[PDB]
Design a binder for this molecule. Structure first.
Ligand SMILES: [Mg+2]
Ligand SMILES: [Mg+2]
Ligand SMILES: [Mg+2]
Ligand SMILES: [Mg+2]
Ligand SMILES: [Mg+2]
Ligand SMILES: [Mg+2]
Ligand SMILES: [Mg+2]
Ligand SMILES: [Mg+2]
Ligand SMILES: [Mg+2]
Ligand SMILES: [Mg+2]
Ligand SMILES: [Mg+2]
Ligand SMILES: [Mg+2]
Ligand SMILES: [Mg+2]
Ligand SMILES: [Mg+2]
Ligand SMILES: [Mg+2]
Ligand SMILES: [Mg+2]
Ligand SMILES: [Mg+2]
Ligand SMILES: [Mg+2]
Ligand SMILES: [Mg+2]
Ligand SMILES: [Mg+2]
Ligand SMILES: [Mg+2]
Ligand SMILES: [Mg+2]
Ligand SMILES: [Mg+2]
Ligand SMILES: [Mg+2]
Ligand SMILES: [Mg+2]
Ligand SMILES: [Mg+2]
Ligand SMILES: [Mg+2]
Ligand SMILES: [Mg+2]
Ligand SMILES: [Mg+2]
Ligand SMILES: [Mg+2]
Ligand SMILES: [Mg+2]
Ligand SMILES: [Mg+2]
Ligand SMILES: [Mg+2]
Ligand SMILES: [Mg+2]
Ligand SMILES: [Mg+2]
Ligand SMILES: [Mg+2]
Ligand SMILES: [Mg+2]
Ligand SMILES: [Mg+2]
Ligand SMILES: [Mg+2]
Ligand SMILES: [Mg+2]
Ligand SMILES: [Mg+2]
Ligand SMILES: [Mg+2]
Ligand SMILES: [Mg+2]
Ligand SMILES: [Mg+2]
Ligand SMILES: [Mg+2]
Ligand SMILES: [Mg+2]
Ligand SMILES: [Mg+2]
Ligand SMILES: [Mg+2]
Ligand SMILES: [Mg+2]
Lengths: 274, 47, 93
RNA sequence: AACGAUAAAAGAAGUGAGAAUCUUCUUCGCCGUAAGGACAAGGGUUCCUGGGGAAGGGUCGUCCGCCCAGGGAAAGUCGGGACCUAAGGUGAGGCCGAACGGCGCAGCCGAUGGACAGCAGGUCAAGAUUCCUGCACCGAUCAUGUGGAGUGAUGGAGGGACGCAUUACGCUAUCCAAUGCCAAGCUAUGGCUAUGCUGGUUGGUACGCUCAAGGGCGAUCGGGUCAGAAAAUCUACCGGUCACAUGCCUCAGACGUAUCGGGAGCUUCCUCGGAAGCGAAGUUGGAAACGCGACGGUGCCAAGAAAAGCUUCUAAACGUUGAAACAUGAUUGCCCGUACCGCAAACCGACACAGGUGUCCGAGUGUCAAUGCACUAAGGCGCGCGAGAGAACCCUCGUUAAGGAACUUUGCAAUCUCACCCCGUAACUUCGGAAGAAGGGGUCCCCACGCUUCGCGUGGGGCGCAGUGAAUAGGCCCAGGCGACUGUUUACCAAAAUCACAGCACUCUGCCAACACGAACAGUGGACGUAUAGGGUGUGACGCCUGCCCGGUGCCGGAA
RNA sequence: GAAACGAUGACUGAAUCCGCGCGGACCACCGCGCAAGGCUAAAUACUCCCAGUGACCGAUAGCGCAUAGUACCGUGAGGG
């Protein structure tokens, strides 16, 4: 489920580790293994836009086509469930009966070797490419596009499930994992099931290092900084605030709606993530 | 302890040189505004 | 042309004994090539050249009064012929 | 005052106008995981020869890294380019922008990396996988042949192609032993007269049914069009079929034989000492790599660059009486870098400066081992002021009667302690720990006996004050405050109670996401991430927990 | 400011002769005028350079320099 550790070192107690005992051990396919360099958070101007990014371990991209519509109407069989360091989830290896291999995202349960399909003409099985309209009411799914062909941008993190509330017009209502209700153009695609990994959410990190190894340079209380540096700075003691909680940029954190008030999305969200 | 100036030929040239100084406007400007002061030392290319 | 290039001969204990060996040594023209030098001496000395080497040398920066100056930098070249084909004009030195 | 580290100097000899300082000699002292050697970066003639002595040298100088003049550096195989790509820098058209300009796909530049044909010896005063000797290898163009029908890209696939830690067998370097082999002479000062003492003891290439641990390894027929734009002897899926142990394959390395070297020295000439000729042996035993066999085995989560060369298919295309492939001979071999200093007097520190500078090699003895400590070898030095004195005082160090923290702001400082083995070891605990707790005892030399060795237990003897005998080498404990912890911090007066942290918590955010850089509808980070994600804020392991006040401020919502 | 006029950024974009524009809000009168198309020597400004002069300097003066942007400092711009 998760490996644990006897307390032989101080930090080797709470520490916890994944269960990769179901990972088809394999060096990911060569003609699918692009090269990701890291970006300190600096952009093409060399200034840290994102903030607090740094190093960790060398990583590579595995192309994971999300629009299965490039090969729907035929099926492939699962070949392996290797380990991507860039995703919160696990990924799986597709052997299309007609030669071409691909990589797709791996869902919850889907045992190594199950032969899965793609096309509107597909059984609600785990791992099928299926349009959202042909999906049963109340069914469990992930990997949802905001338009046909675009690419699956919904339900991708570990153990996530967008849930078909049901059809309507040509826009199917949907339950986002955040707790939101979204209209989706029924010619949008889907992949049946929960994401899996699932266990992820729970692995205790355990020590500084473990943060570093995923490349998350140490985070910083502005309450450390000085006036010159950032808002909450100054003081003579472990000091409070003296103003309302606020980002470095002074635009309040803690209870301040930040979404842009006018938008085109505003007539596709029937409810709010509350 | 250890000092400010640790020479690096490639650095020196790729930093202060002539292809470099001409690559930018303000370096053209540095150039001719040097020339006027009768520099023999035009540029670290001329070392 | 087929002469201009060979800016001089080389003069020293070394050069002399190499000559004695059948290996001849000249200053040449910095910009030149080894193919160019081969063509050169092969032309103006009617010899079979089978061996060659070159080496660019700086120039002893020297002062004559408050005038620190560099000398012109040369390109020493060595050639080895075949079958004891000694060159005449230098064979007396 | 100081002459730049307390590594240390003496006597003889020589030279000169002049010598503590320069040159020979014989000793002494210091370094020896360096204070030796080889590179890189940097410097630039500082290298070698002959000369000079104004100034540079912390004194002196006849000397020098200073002055003068002259010489010295050699590559098809090393290194870079004529090949490749990373970050990054670029970049016609393209996207933007008061101007200058900012972006930006392909392409191109970019080594710190990929790729790649040569090794052994010899020598100038001064070069060396370059030159010279010996025997190789690679590409290129032509020719005589085997030719006798296919060659195989600007696109296809394969391959190149990679993490940390631990580790099995084989082996090399390379080092030790010896009444192995070779060579050399000698008898010391009481003895030894060799079974003593000193030194040397295989490098390359070629073959050879010789020995060899290790390591990689399948194959062929057919289907599916829909996979690689298409093609397709290829590559990928599906299916069938093939003596599991394996053989197929490779040969680090060793043994033999041969040949080329090298080899202690020996000889001969002779001019502050070299020039030249010659040349013996080649053993058993043991140790052993971070190197090679190698892209081996196993475990682990943090999940480990790209591109060309390369290998395979086909497209056009010209050929299919000269298509590839091959053997041999000819022939060809571009460009810069190679001196020297390079842990330092030659680079960066204004200096011939107790600093700084990245990788490699770095022998022996003793030591549980070791790049550790003492002493050494090869090698490199005695650090460019000297001599005497032997007061105060100052610096670094030894010893210390009685006492033993009386010192003092405080045991600050300094001593204690010190390694390996064996006995033994507390409250407390998160059951890991505390813990090397504490506290003891042993340690050297000889003979016999056993045992798995160099080695070690046992028994008896021996000596000294003492036997990790010299050097490297923890003082310990009780009890609090703060933080949990490993970490971080004020370059040059503060290293902690700071900060970070794993953990938890509030909110924000549904993708052209918030948020952030931005002439700006550009483009970028966020992220090739998707609410088990991302931002911001606060607390700061863990454990039991986290109450009362919504009036003011902020925030969320509401609508007359 | 009573703000005319020109001038443009964004919205609007009339008359062409019994017509158009101005006369410092605005109105009549009465005057000066031809927007939406272009070129134009001359006088004027400067002085790297050449020459002539001087109740300008003569070696701390005079340019920074009897010459040198060199020696020297600075990673650089630059100082000198
Ligand atoms: Mg935090
Ligand atoms: Mg502060
Ligand atoms: Mg402060
Ligand atoms: Mg402020
Ligand atoms: Mg404050
Ligand atoms: Mg050359
Ligand atoms: Mg000189
Ligand atoms: Mg004195
Ligand atoms: Mg001294
Ligand atoms: Mg002394
Ligand atoms: Mg003598
Ligand atoms: Mg005399
Ligand atoms: Mg001395
Ligand atoms: Mg050294
Ligand atoms: Mg010398
Ligand atoms: Mg002197
Ligand atoms: Mg003399
Ligand atoms: Mg650019
Ligand atoms: Mg390189
Ligand atoms: Mg090579
Ligand atoms: Mg090369
Ligand atoms: Mg050769
Ligand atoms: Mg081994
Ligand atoms: Mg013996
Ligand atoms: Mg005797
Ligand atoms: Mg012996
Ligand atoms: Mg390319
Ligand atoms: Mg050089
Ligand atoms: Mg000195
Ligand atoms: Mg020094
Ligand atoms: Mg060693
Ligand atoms: Mg040693
Ligand atoms: Mg030592
Ligand atoms: Mg030395
Ligand atoms: Mg006296
Ligand atoms: Mg005492
Ligand atoms: Mg006593
Ligand atoms: Mg103390
Ligand atoms: Mg216990
Ligand atoms: Mg103890
Ligand atoms: Mg006794
Ligand atoms: Mg005893
Ligand atoms: Mg100690
Ligand atoms: Mg702490
Ligand atoms: Mg400080
Ligand atoms: Mg301090
Ligand atoms: Mg107006
Ligand atoms: Mg005067
Ligand atoms: Mg003057």
């Amino acid at each position: 489920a998760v490996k644990k550790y006897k307390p032989y070192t101080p930090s080797r107690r709470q520490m916890t580790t994944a269960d990769f005992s179901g990972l088809a051990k394999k060096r990911p396919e060569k003609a699918l293994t692009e090269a990701l360099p890291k970006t300190g958070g600096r952009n093409n101007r060399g200034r840290i836009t994102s903030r607090f990014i740094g190093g960790g371990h060398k990583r590579l991209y595995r192309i994971i086509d999300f629009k299965r519509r490039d090969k729907s109407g035929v099926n492939a069989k699962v070949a392996a469930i290797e380990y991507d360091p860039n995703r919160s989830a696990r990924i799986a290896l597709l052997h299309y009966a007609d030669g071409e291999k691909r990589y797709i995202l791996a869902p919850e349960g889907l045992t190594v070797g199950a032969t899965v399909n793609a096309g509107p003409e597909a059984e609600p099985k785990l791992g099928n490419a299926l349009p959202l309209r042909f999906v049963p009411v109340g069914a469990v799914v992930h990997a949802l596009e905001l338009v046909p062909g675009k690419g699956a941008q919904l339900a991708r993190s570990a153990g996530t499930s967008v849930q078909v509330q049901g059809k309507e017009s040509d826009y199917v209502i949907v339950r986002l994992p955040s707790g939101e209700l979204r209209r989706v153009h029924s010619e949008c695609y889907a992949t049946i099931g929960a994401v899996g990994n699932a266990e992820h959410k729970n692995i205790v990190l355990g020590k500084a290092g473990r943060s570093r190894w995923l490349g998350r340079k140490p985070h910083q209380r502005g309450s450390a900084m000085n006036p010159v540096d950032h808002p909450h700075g100054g003081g003579e003691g472990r000091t409070g605030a003296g103003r309302v909680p606020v980002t470095p940029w002074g635009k309040p954190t803690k209870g301040l709606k930040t979404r842009r008030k006018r938008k085109t999305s505003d007539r596709f969200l029937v409810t709010r993530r509350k | 302890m250890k000092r400010t100036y640790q020479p690096n030929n490639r650095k020196r040239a790729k930093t202060h040189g002539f292809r470099a100084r001409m690559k930018t406007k303000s370096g053209r400007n540095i150039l001719a505004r040097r020339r006027a002061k009768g520099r023999h030392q035009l540029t670290v290319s001329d070392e | 042309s087929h002469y201009d290039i060979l800016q001089a001969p080389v003069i020293s204990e070394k050069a002399y004994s190499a000559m004695e060996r059948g290996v001849y040594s000249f200053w040449v023209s910095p910009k030149a090539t080894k193919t160019e030098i081969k063509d050169a001496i092969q032309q103006a000395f009617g010899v079979r050249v089978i061996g060659i080497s070159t080496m660019n040398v700086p120039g002893k920066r020297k002062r004559v009064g408050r005038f620190i100056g560099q000398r012109n930098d040369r390109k020493k070249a060595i050639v080895r012929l075949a079958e004891g084909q000694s060159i005449e004009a230098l064979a007396g030195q």
